Write a protein that binds this ligand. Sequence first.
Ligand SMILES: NC(=O)C1=CN([C@@H]2O[C@H](COP(=O)(O)OP(=O)(O)OC[C@H]3O[C@@H](n4cnc5c(N)ncnc54)[C@H](OP(=O)(O)O)[C@@H]3O)[C@@H](O)[C@H]2O)C=CC1
Ligand SMILES: NC(=O)C1=CN([C@@H]2O[C@H](COP(=O)(O)OP(=O)(O)OC[C@H]3O[C@@H](n4cnc5c(N)ncnc54)[C@H](OP(=O)(O)O)[C@@H]3O)[C@@H](O)[C@H]2O)C=CC1
Ligand SMILES: NC(=O)C1=CN([C@@H]2O[C@H](COP(=O)(O)OP(=O)(O)OC[C@H]3O[C@@H](n4cnc5c(N)ncnc54)[C@H](OP(=O)(O)O)[C@@H]3O)[C@@H](O)[C@H]2O)C=CC1
Ligand SMILES: NC(=O)C1=CN([C@@H]2O[C@H](COP(=O)(O)OP(=O)(O)OC[C@H]3O[C@@H](n4cnc5c(N)ncnc54)[C@H](OP(=O)(O)O)[C@@H]3O)[C@@H](O)[C@H]2O)C=CC1
Ligand SMILES: CN1[C@@H]2CC[C@H]1CC(=O)C2
Ligand SMILES: CN1[C@@H]2CC[C@H]1CC(=O)C2
Ligand SMILES: CN1[C@@H]2CC[C@H]1CC(=O)C2
Ligand SMILES: CN1[C@@H]2CC[C@H]1CC(=O)C2
Lengths: 274, 274, 274, 274
Amino acid sequence: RFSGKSVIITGSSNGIGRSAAVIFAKEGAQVTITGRNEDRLEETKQQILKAGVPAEKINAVVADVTEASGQDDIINTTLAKFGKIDILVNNAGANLADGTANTDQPVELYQKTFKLNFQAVIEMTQKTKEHLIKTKGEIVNVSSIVAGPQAHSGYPYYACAKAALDQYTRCTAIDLIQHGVRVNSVSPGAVATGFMGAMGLPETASDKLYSFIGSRKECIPVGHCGKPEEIANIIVFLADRNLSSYIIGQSIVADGGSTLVMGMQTHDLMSVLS
Amino acid sequence: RFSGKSVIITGSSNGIGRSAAVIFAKEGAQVTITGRNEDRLEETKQQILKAGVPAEKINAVVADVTEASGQDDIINTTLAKFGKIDILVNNAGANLADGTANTDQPVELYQKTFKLNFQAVIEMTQKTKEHLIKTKGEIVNVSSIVAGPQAHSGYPYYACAKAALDQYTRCTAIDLIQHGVRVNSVSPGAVATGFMGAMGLPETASDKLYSFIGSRKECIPVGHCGKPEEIANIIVFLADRNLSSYIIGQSIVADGGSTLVMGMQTHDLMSVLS
Amino acid sequence: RFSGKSVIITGSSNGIGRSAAVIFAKEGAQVTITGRNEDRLEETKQQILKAGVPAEKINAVVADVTEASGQDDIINTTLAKFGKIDILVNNAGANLADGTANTDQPVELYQKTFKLNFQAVIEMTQKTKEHLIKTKGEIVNVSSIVAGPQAHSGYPYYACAKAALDQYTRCTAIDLIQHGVRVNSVSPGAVATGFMGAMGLPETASDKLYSFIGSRKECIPVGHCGKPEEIANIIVFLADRNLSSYIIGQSIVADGGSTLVMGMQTHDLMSVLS
Amino acid sequence: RFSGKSVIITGSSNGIGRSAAVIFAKEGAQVTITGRNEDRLEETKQQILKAGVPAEKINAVVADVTEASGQDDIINTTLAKFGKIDILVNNAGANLADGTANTDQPVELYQKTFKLNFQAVIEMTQKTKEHLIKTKGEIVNVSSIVAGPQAHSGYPYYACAKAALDQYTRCTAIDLIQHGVRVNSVSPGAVATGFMGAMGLPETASDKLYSFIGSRKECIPVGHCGKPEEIANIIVFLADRNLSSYIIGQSIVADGGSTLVMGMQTHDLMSVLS
Ligand SMILES: NC(=O)C1=CN([C@@H]2O[C@H](COP(=O)(O)OP(=O)(O)OC[C@H]3O[C@@H](n4cnc5c(N)ncnc54)[C@H](OP(=O)(O)O)[C@@H]3O)[C@@H](O)[C@H]2O)C=CC1
Ligand SMILES: NC(=O)C1=CN([C@@H]2O[C@H](COP(=O)(O)OP(=O)(O)OC[C@H]3O[C@@H](n4cnc5c(N)ncnc54)[C@H](OP(=O)(O)O)[C@@H]3O)[C@@H](O)[C@H]2O)C=CC1
Ligand SMILES: NC(=O)C1=CN([C@@H]2O[C@H](COP(=O)(O)OP(=O)(O)OC[C@H]3O[C@@H](n4cnc5c(N)ncnc54)[C@H](OP(=O)(O)O)[C@@H]3O)[C@@H](O)[C@H]2O)C=CC1
Ligand SMILES: NC(=O)C1=CN([C@@H]2O[C@H](COP(=O)(O)OP(=O)(O)OC[C@H]3O[C@@H](n4cnc5c(N)ncnc54)[C@H](OP(=O)(O)O)[C@@H]3O)[C@@H](O)[C@H]2O)C=CC1
Ligand SMILES: CN1[C@@H]2CC[C@H]1CC(=O)C2
Ligand SMILES: CN1[C@@H]2CC[C@H]1CC(=O)C2
Ligand SMILES: CN1[C@@H]2CC[C@H]1CC(=O)C2
Ligand SMILES: CN1[C@@H]2CC[C@H]1CC(=O)C2
């Protein structure tokens, strides 16, 4: 339970952020849900309400997490309404696509990619710090296996932003634990959300993709494509001092086993000898 | 909840294994607790009973996990009494000490060390496999930060056994997930248990040690020495398909942040310039 | 030998870059040395000339690696004077300081730190590619143990920039190898150079700091503080396709063993028991 | 040069060891080559003689590295003929096969796999130490990408033995460096040698297998299967204190980029959408 806890979940107007928000709410938390898409943000709110959570325990904020005023709005409204902040979930993120790929992607794409997936995390962390230390709270960042240890050459900026995020999780974890706040992270593998849709893929195509990798053991050993709730459960676990108190500055990989398979292992000996 | 689940926790006559066993039991599991020390095994049983768990839901077995007959006894009695096996927790382990240290420790110490911390894990895994696949169960191994990434030159065999364990967790996870069983692990940092006592340290000395590292931020950033329950909570989380289903073949580090600190970082710039 | 090889070493006006430059030159390579400080760049040129290398083999360029103008001059002058580019070593880097520390360092320091330690690498890589694939050349990046696996909470942006670099090395390595160009990196530990001076420390304080860590085994196990040449040697090995041809997208750690020591290991058992 | 250097290369009767042996010899070192197969050991000696090296510089010893008798002969003959030992390269190793696979391989295969790939290293290290600290020598271990970070479920014991080796390299490196001896390692990926033959594959099948993976970029990004010399080169670099002096307790990965590819990346987006 997170009864009474004030929780801020960035990027909760869809996917992982949404699931996490409903879980926190079902666990008795006062949650600040936010995003840019007003319709989807409303959908998240309705799912929480449908869960039997009173409207006063929900603070929906329409904002761009990369904008200073948007960040301030998210934080100020949660403070005004809940009077404190216990947990910060830096979940908002995306693999920004402009049509280019590989090392040829423009630096402008690099700037925007880092602006969202990294700089915004720094800013939310800095602006939330003082409040988290007054409650001896938590921070849970949402990284990705795209950070490594394998190469993700098709989209280096997104991959490197996450890699930067991981070391930021470790740095802020060791610095902030001094003041009583724990910092950890989750590195998801493939998760069927609106992620590919945001990259430009029609629902029909994103579905085909998630379905394909979810059925190929060399893609996802576990036998199914990740679901938002599966990642949300681990974000919640890491946000629960009572259960994960001894875990500090770590990002637990949740990829159904994807990173445990090499490209060379997709061929079996026999078939190669034929 | 683990209502009805059949759980085998090796090394549950003390420390982490004990805590995990009581948690599983409190969660409604039928637990097989085992060890070599009859008195301590009984103490674990009593703690479970004191928790309000009926005696029929407890299978206490006195055995040496490195002995074939001991392993068989553990497995057979749990099958006879519970009729199935859902979770295997390879927790039994120890840093065997014979008075020597560093690369000079004898190979005989290496053989015994691996016999317990590694070979016994292989054997329990092989003998439990078929039953775990009939229930599409779980395996949770208990490794250690002594496996790396830092060197632990004072006791190379214990350190290397754990390192071997980690790759075994990954290997068996990818091989066994094909048949529906998930395999993960936990790599604890310092935990105040009977661990140092088993190495030859009197309770008074082990207490002084755990107390010292628990109060030095450069030793354990979190501000306290690990408690068995803190590691147990994560073993339980990993044993819960419903919550950690997408985590496969991973060992989550729980060391209060110890491995995040370098030896060179124990000196601050100013004091060095003085 | 690098006879018939055109090499560009950014940040070769001092420290590691300087050493790398003199070795490449001694091995018969046409070398382009660069930096912002003309006095020190001249000193580098001087050491190369003293090594018996003819002036027509050395192309000194004053430039700011973060400015497009500087980048273009570095590349164009080499192409104009040497007609091609075989090796590019992204050595330029620094832990920018503004007096602030920890998670409190301003985003402005972040932006400047990344522009130098990461964006400059992206840009030099993008602008040199074409010529490197022309000669089936090499790329050697210089990172730092500051990227991980330990936390470096005092200067997060410098740490995270290096963490991003490492994933960039991997991404470009896998992307550019299909065009015949190898990408690798070296992650140095502490090395007595002008690094600390650039941070604001007078030579006396710098020498003191370096001497101290070089004499404490819990700081640098190898027994001495690293010297520029020790890192230059491995940069040269990685730049020599004839010798390291099978190493791809890797960053070899050269820290005299620093990352192999935990902060907790700085205290021996007996000291604690008293 | 290794002029005035006495070098022991276990497993130098074939593959990587053979290549390493010829290079060391070409660099003017007194070399001790060893193996069990006298025919192949002779072939190694022959290549060294053909390289212009005098017979008094080469000490061929027939021995089983897993037997104390063999270990003592390897060491004593070198000391008797060359008077000292400067470098020890633990190259001997093999993925022992008995027809079984996966987590089902018997503990008996485990014991044999570890005795060769791990215990033999412990023993050679313990028995050579004294002489290595006498000359402030080097130790280079040969591991494998088989240790991780990916799973290698088909042959767990060989994989785990290498994982144990890596932590042993780190432990002994930090322990032996205080006595002036450097310990490092190289983790090769696929390399066309007699490795597959030892596993039971006829030369034709072996050549086919090696050619296949060397031509598929998702298998070996670099474009070719590794050759013994490519690994020997890095072993020699690590054995050359004059060049790698600052590298301690590290195992550089030389797999032509294999570990940088995920099984999921073997499928491109467009192929999936159709
Ligand atoms: N899906 C996958 O396979 C993986 C996802 N991840 C991580 O998960 C997160 C994304 O969620 P899913 O993963 O659920 O993605 P979508 O389901 O892609 O969710 C994106 C979320 O973040 C928000 N967001 C994106 N950019 C901005 C912005 N500039 N300002 C405010 N909000 C923004 C979206 O808001 P709305 O659209 O209004 O803007 C939305 O709530 C990222 O941190 C991502 O890296 C990591 C690994 C794999
Ligand atoms: N304590 C710490 O700081 C850390 C502990 N760990 C891991 O935790 C586990 C040990 O528990 P704690 O950690 O709680 O240790 P103790 O509290 O040391 O518990 C040891 C447990 O394992 C059992 N055990 C040991 N050897 C054998 C054997 N041959 N046959 C049967 N049972 C055996 C003991 O049985 P009884 O004594 O009868 O025999 C007991 O239940 C190991 O896996 C260890 O590596 C990992 C990192 C840190
Ligand atoms: N020293 C250490 O302990 C470690 C160093 N490293 C890496 O080594 C590199 C730094 O070299 P040393 O290590 O030799 O450092 P200094 O000896 O600090 O050398 C810095 C070098 O880079 C150049 N440089 C810095 N900023 C710029 C800029 N904006 N434009 C052009 N050139 C610039 C300097 O040129 P001049 O000042 O004219 O501009 C100089 O040649 C970095 O990549 C750093 O991260 C990694 C780990 C440890
Ligand atoms: N080939 C590959 O793709 C990879 C190889 N490696 C490592 O390379 C080494 C093997 O060499 P290649 O790689 O050249 O293999 P083979 O070409 O397989 O060479 C095996 C070598 O070790 C010796 N050897 C094996 N078992 C014993 C024993 N019991 N006693 C004495 N010598 C023994 C052989 O001697 P002879 O048979 O007389 O006994 C021979 O010189 C191992 O350490 C292996 O793990 C790591 C990764 C990949
Ligand atoms: C890197 N890439 C990200 C997350 C896993 C993988 C597949 C996908 O669909 C999006
Ligand atoms: C390696 N060593 C093990 C576990 C953490 C560290 C301290 C201790 O007391 C026992
Ligand atoms: C790697 N090395 C460490 C931390 C940053 C850099 C400079 C120094 O003096 C100590
Ligand atoms: C590293 N390399 C991989 C797996 C084991 C070894 C032999 C081979 O042919 C492929």
